[PDB]
Amino acid sequence: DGVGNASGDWHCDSTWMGDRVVTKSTRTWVLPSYNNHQYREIKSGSVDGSNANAYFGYSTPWGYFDFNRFHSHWSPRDWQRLINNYWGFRPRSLRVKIFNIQVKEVTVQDSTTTIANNLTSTVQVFTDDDYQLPYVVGNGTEGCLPAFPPQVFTLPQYGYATLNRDNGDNPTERSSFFCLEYFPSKMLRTGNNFEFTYSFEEVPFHCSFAPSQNLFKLANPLVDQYLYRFVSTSATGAIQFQKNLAGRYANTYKNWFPGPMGRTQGWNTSSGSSTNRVSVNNFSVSNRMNLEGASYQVNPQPNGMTNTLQGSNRYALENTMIFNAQNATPGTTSVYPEDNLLLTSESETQPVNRVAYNTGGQMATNAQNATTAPTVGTYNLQEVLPGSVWMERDVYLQGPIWAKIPETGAHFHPSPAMGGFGLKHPPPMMLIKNTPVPGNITSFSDVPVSSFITQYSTGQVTVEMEWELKKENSKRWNPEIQYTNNYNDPQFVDFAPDGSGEYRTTRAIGTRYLTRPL
Amino acid sequence: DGVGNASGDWHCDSTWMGDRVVTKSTRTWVLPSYNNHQYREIKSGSVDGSNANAYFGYSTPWGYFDFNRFHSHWSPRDWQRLINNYWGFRPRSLRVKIFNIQVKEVTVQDSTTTIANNLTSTVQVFTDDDYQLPYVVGNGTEGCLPAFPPQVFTLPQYGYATLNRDNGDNPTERSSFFCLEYFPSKMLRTGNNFEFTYSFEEVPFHCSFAPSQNLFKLANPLVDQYLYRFVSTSATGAIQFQKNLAGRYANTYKNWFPGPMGRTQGWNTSSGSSTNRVSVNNFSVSNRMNLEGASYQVNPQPNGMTNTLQGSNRYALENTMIFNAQNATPGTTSVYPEDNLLLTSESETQPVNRVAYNTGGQMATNAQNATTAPTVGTYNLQEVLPGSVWMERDVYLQGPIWAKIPETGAHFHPSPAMGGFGLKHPPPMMLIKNTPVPGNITSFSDVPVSSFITQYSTGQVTVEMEWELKKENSKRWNPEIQYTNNYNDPQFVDFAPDGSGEYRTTRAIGTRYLTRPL
Amino acid sequence: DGVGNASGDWHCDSTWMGDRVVTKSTRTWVLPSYNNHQYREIKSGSVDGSNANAYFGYSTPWGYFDFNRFHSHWSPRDWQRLINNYWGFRPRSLRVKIFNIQVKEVTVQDSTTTIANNLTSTVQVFTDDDYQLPYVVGNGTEGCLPAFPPQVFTLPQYGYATLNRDNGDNPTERSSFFCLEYFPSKMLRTGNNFEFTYSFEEVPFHCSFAPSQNLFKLANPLVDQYLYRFVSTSATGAIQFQKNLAGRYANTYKNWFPGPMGRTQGWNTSSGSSTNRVSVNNFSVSNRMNLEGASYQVNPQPNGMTNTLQGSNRYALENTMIFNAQNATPGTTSVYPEDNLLLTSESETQPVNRVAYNTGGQMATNAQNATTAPTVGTYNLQEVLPGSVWMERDVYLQGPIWAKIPETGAHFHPSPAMGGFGLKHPPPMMLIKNTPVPGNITSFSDVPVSSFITQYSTGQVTVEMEWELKKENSKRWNPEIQYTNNYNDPQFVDFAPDGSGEYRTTRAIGTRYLTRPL
C-alpha cells in the first residue's frame, strides 16, 4: 500500500469469555540473511563417540516462525488463572499475521558500517499447508516468540536432516532434497502485510487435574468383598482360601491396572547428593533404543510414569523435563549444577502412574512341584496391558504446545513424550526469507551471480489463538491447592525484569493443581 | 438358457480412471470330484515330533475360489505402474461371475478312458454371506487364480480343522461339524451362469511410500534444544547437566518411539555363508508361542520390525516372507537353497522400525547407592508403548490381499502379520461342487448309494475389483527411485513364458518405492 | 441362439453401382489348436551365415484372419472389368463376420481317431482396435482367404519377433511380451456369431493408368524455346550459346525430373540366359541395408523405378515382385526356374520412372581450369530431389492391399515398397482361438493343468468391402489396350480348376492398362 502508513496495529491481550479464551501476542522479529542466499549440504560424522550423532541434511536460506511454547501466548498471571480454575483446555483456532516490514541494507564500506533502509526490497513468505516439507517445529527447539513481549527475537534458520548411510555423513539413494523456492510464496515490500488462518482438529482436552484417590484403593473401606483369595497350602498340599476383608487393599481384587513402565535410574537431588554415586558418565548407563545400528537416548521416556515420589529428593532424571531459568547462548558446552535449572516433577500423578526408579512388580518364574518351591521374578519394564490406565505428562508454561504425529500409517496412542497435543495436521510451518538483490554485475556469465548486497529485515508478528476450556464442577468441601506467588525474603520479583532489564523466571509452572475423585 | 449359446464373455483388462482403477480377470478352472461325494473326518497325531501338528477336522467334497493374491488381479506392468505413482490404495468393490460351465463324464471302461460331456448334469454354488463357516481363504494357502491368464487351474478342496483334544487326533465335546449342503445353493447346468457382488468396508489405505527421515532425527540440525540433560555426577555426588546442542541426535529429547520388537535370529545370505553357524535345525531354536500346551512357530512375527538393515547380507529369516520363483507340486519335502527363492526385504522401513536381530535397547537393572554402581540391561522384546509409531509390512505382487480378523471380541490393531488388509467381513467364500449322479442301482436299500458316475467340471470365472488410489503430491526436487526392469545379460524375459511355455518370475515386487518426509 | 439354426448365410457377390462397388466373400476356415494352448518363446541364431536371420520372439496359441490380398475380394473377371474401365480406386469400408462355428473333439483312442462334435465348447475372438499388438498382416505373409471360394483354409498362427540382443537369440531389457488373453474377447458356442465393422481413412486413389507421354518430351515439337544453352567454348575461352530448337528434346530445358533411383543388377530372362553370368550367389552381390550391425536384402527396393525396359528380356530381379502360379507347401527350400513363376513387369511406367539396371545419370566431378578438362561422373543412386515425379508400384490381383505405416513419428511419402495403400490405422487384426477344455484331472496341484482334450474348429467368414472408383474421361481417339483372355492352343482354362480340381492361375494381372496424357 504505502510507505508512510502502518500495515497493522499491536494487539496483545487476553479475553476470557466463559468457556473460551482468546489470546493474542505481537512481537518484533529480525531476519538475517542466512547462508548468503544459498543452500548448503550440511553433514556430520559420529561425534562424542556415538554414530547416532552422524547425519546428512540441508541448511536453507530461510527462517521460520515458531509459536510452539505456551509462554508465547500466556502471561504468568493468565496461566495461573487457568490452572487454578479449569479442569482442562484444548486449542481451537489460530490466526497469524505479519506486518510493518522493513528491509535494511547494511554496508561496511570503509571499515565502518552504515545501515540505510531499502524501500524496494521484498521479503518472501509461504505457509506449508499440505505438509510436504520436513516439519521441525515440534521438537523442542529454540527459536520461539520470546516469553516477554518487549523482547525482540531473530528467526531461526530452516534446515533438516534426511537419510544418511550406514551411520555416516553420506547420503542414500532415498535421501531427498526439498527446494523451498519450489513453493508459491507471497512477496512483501514495506507496505504489505501477510495473513493466515488455521483451525485445529478435534483433540482431546488436556487434563489439568490430579487424582484424589489411589488406583488400588477404589473399593469401599467399610464393606468386604464377596470374593476369596488363595492364601496358602496345607501340609496335605490342599489349597486354602480366605475372604477379602475391608480396608485390606493389599489383597483386594482389582479391576484396573497402572500403566506402562520402564525403569530408569534415580538420582538424589542436592539434599541427598551424598548418597548419589560419585562421578558417573550417564551415557554409558542410560536408557537407549537402537534404530538402524545406532544407540539413541530416549529421554524423557514414554508416558505412564512419575519421575518422583512426593516427599523424596530422589529423581528419575531421564524421565524428567529440564528447562533453564536464565536463557542461554548457542553452542554452550558448559556443565551446570541443578541450581538455575527447573526440574519438573510429576508426582501429582503418583496416585495412578508408577515411580520410574522402582521395579514394576513381581511375577512367577516357574512351576511348583512336590520338589520345586514357588519363585518370583521382579520385572523392570512392562508395556501396555489390557485394562490399564495412566495419566499423560503435564504441560508447562515454558513447555511445548503440540507435536506432529509421524505419518507412517500405524501408531498407538499418539501423545508426545514431551507433553502437548499430538496432531495429524498441526499448524502449518511459516517460512520467510529476504529476496536477494545482486551486487554490481557488469558482464554475462552463465554462472549464477554470487555477489549480493547484505540486508536484513525486521517486522512484527501477531498470533491469536482461541482455546476451549473445561469448567471444573467438584463437590469437594475443604479448600484445594492453588498455584500461589509464595516466596520468602524476595530480593527480586519473579516473572519480571531485573535491574539490568533481563527477564527472570525461577519457577516452572505446571498444570495439575485441582483434584478429582478417580 | 441354451446349450449352444455362451453364458458370458472374456473380460480381462484394467482401466485407470483418475483415483480409481478397475481390474478384471477371467480364468478357466477345473473342478474334480473330491472325496467321491462324501465327507470324511480327517485327523492327525503329533508329526515331526511336535504335537502342534496334531489336528482333527473334516474334508468335504467341495472346492472353493480364492482371489486372495495380488497377481490374480494385477499384471506386472500394472503393478509397477501403481507402485511408482501412488502413495497408497485400498479395495472398494468386488464382483465375481461364473459361466460357460461344462460337465464331463469320464469312463475307464475297457482299460481305456473316454471323456464324453453330460448335458443334464449340474454344479452347485453358494457364497457364505454371513460367515457361518470356517474361513480358510486368508491363510496363505495355495489355490488361487494363476498369475498368468492362459493358465488353467484346479479348484482346491474345502476342509477345516476344528477343536482337537489334548494335542491329539481326537475331538472334544465342542468340536463342530458343518454340513455345507445345509446352505441354500444355486444349481447350474451348461446354460446357466452365477453372479455375485460385494463391497468392502472402509479400510485404511496401504501406505506405499517409504520415509525419507529417521524417526530420531526429526529435529532441526541447526537450532539447539531449550532442554538440558543429566550428563554426570561430580565427586560430591552432585548431579550435573548440559544443554542439548544441534545435530547431536544421540542426546536430543525425543517425542516419538519406534514400534514393537521381538528379537529373532539373523542369518547371513550367500555372500556370508561362511559366517553362519554350520548345520543348525532351526525348530529347536526358533521363536515360538505356546497355545494349549503346544509350541507353534510364529513366523513371520508381529508387525513393527525390519528383517534386514539396508547394506548388509544378514537376514532375520523368521521375520521374512519367502516365496518361490518356480511354482511347486503338492507334498514336496525337498530342501531348497536360496537361489530360486524370493526373500522379501523390508529395509525401506529401517528409518522407523527396528532390526529384528539386534537388542532393542538397554534399560536400568538397579538403583545406585553410595555403594552400588548404575547398571543397564539390554532387552530382547518390547511390546507396544504409548506414543510409538511403526510401519506395517508391505504387500507384494505374489502376496495376499486381505485376511479375516477372528471374531473373539477383543483385539489390538487388526493388521495381519502377512500383510494385506484386515477385515471384519471379508469377501465371502465361494464354494462349488459337482452334484452327484448315481450309477446303475437296481434295488431298494435303506443304505445310501455309493456307486457314482465319475465326472468333472470346467468353466470360466471372471472377477472384477475396483480400487481406490491415493495420489502422490510431493515437493521433492531430485528424482525418486522407481521399480525398473533392470536386468543384465538377459537369457530370458522376466514375467513371461520361457521356451517350454512355463511362466517365469524372478523378482518379488513390493510396494515401497516413493518417499515421504516423516 | 440355437444348435439347429444357422447363424448366417453365404453371401458372395459383387455389386457395381456407379462410382462404388461392393464386394463380398465368404469362406470356410479351420482353426487348429496351436501350441497346445501355450505361449512359447521362439528364437533363432544366425542362419544361412547371416546374423540378420537371428531373432527372438513369441509364438501364441492364436490364429488370425488375413484379408490382405486382392484376390480375396475380386474374381478375375471383376478385376479385369475394373482395370479396363477405371482410372483408380480406393477402399472405403469393411465389414467382417464370423458364423456357423463348429468345434470338433478329436480322439485317437485305440490307434484310431474318432471325430465327434462338442456342443458346449467355445471359440474366443477379439479385434485389436487400438493397435496395441504387433501388426503382422501387411508383410506379404501367407494365410489369406484363398483365391477360389470353394477352397477351405486353415488360419495361420499368430507370433511376433521382438527386440533381440547383438544379433543373437537373446532378449534385451526392452523386449516385450504381449499377453493376448489380456484383451477383452467374445466367446462363441455353436449358435453364436461375431460381427465387426470398419471404415478407412481417406487415402489417395491408386492410379491405374499409364502415362502416354515421356516426362522429358512434354514441350511442343513444333515451337522452339526462347531459352539458350551453353554449347561450347571458343579458342579464346569465350563461352558460346545456341538456341533450343524444336523437337530436340535432348537439349530442351526441363521443368520436372524423374524420381528416385538405386541401381540394382539386371539379369536376362530365358531368351537371353546365355548372356547372364554363370553360377552367381546373389546374396553376396545384392543390394543391402545395414540396421544395427546386420545386412538385410531390401527387395523390392523403394518406389520410383521400373524393373524393366519394354521390349527387352533383361530384368532387375531385386526390384521385382515374384509370385507363384501353383501354390506351395510350408518349409520348401527347393530351387525353382522362371517357368511357373509370375515375374511382374512395371514398364508402363517407363515413361516416367528410370530403369533399375542403368546408371541414373552423370554429373560433374571437378572444376575446369586453363589446365584441367571438364570431367563427368556417372552416379548409381539418387534420392528424392525437389520437383521430381514418379509413379508408384502397381497392384496385382495376387498382391497385397494395404500396409501399416510404422508409428515412429517421422516418415516421408508413406507408400509401401510392395504396393497397396499405406495406412496409419489399417483394418484391425482379428485373432481367434479355441478355448481350452481340461482332460481328466483328479487332484489339486498349484501347478497349471497340461492335459487338454484335442479339438479344432471350423466355421465361415464373410468379409464385405466397399470401394470407390475414379471414372476415366479421356478424349483419346484410337482404341486403348485392355486386359484380354489372349491364349493360343489352350490345353486348359486359366483361372479355373483343372482335371484334379486344383485352381490354375498362369498370369499376374496388374492394373495399368488405360493411358493418360502426362
Numbering used by the authors:
A (entry chain A), B (entry chain A), C (entry chain A): 209 to 726
Q: Which passages does the manuscript contain on this structure?
A:
Cryo-EM single particle analysis (SPA) yielded a reconstruction at 2.9 Å resolution for AAVGo.1. The structure of AAVGo.1, solved by cryo-EM to 2.9 Å resolution, is most similar to AAV5. The AAVGo.1 capsid has a similar protein fold and surface topology to AAV5 structures. The capsid core, comprising a jellyroll fold found in many virus structures, and a single α-helix (αA), is the most conserved feature of AAVs, and AAVGo.1 is no exception. The AAVGo.1 core jellyroll has the standard topology with a backbone chain alternating between two stacked antiparallel β-sheets (almost rolling into a single tube). AAVGo.1 and AAV5 capsid proteins have high homology (94%). DE loop (VR-II), which forms the outer edge of the pore-like structure of the 5-fold axis, protrudes an additional 1.5 Å compared to AAV5. A double serine insertion in VR-V of AAVGo.1 leads to two dislocations of 2.1 Å and 3.0 Å in the carbon backbone compared to AAV5. In conclusion, AAVGo.1 amino acid differences account for displacements up to 3.0 Å in VR-II and VR-V compared to the atomic structure of AAV5. AAVGo.1 residues Thr477 to Ser482 are of below-average order in the sharpened maps of AAVGo.1 alone.
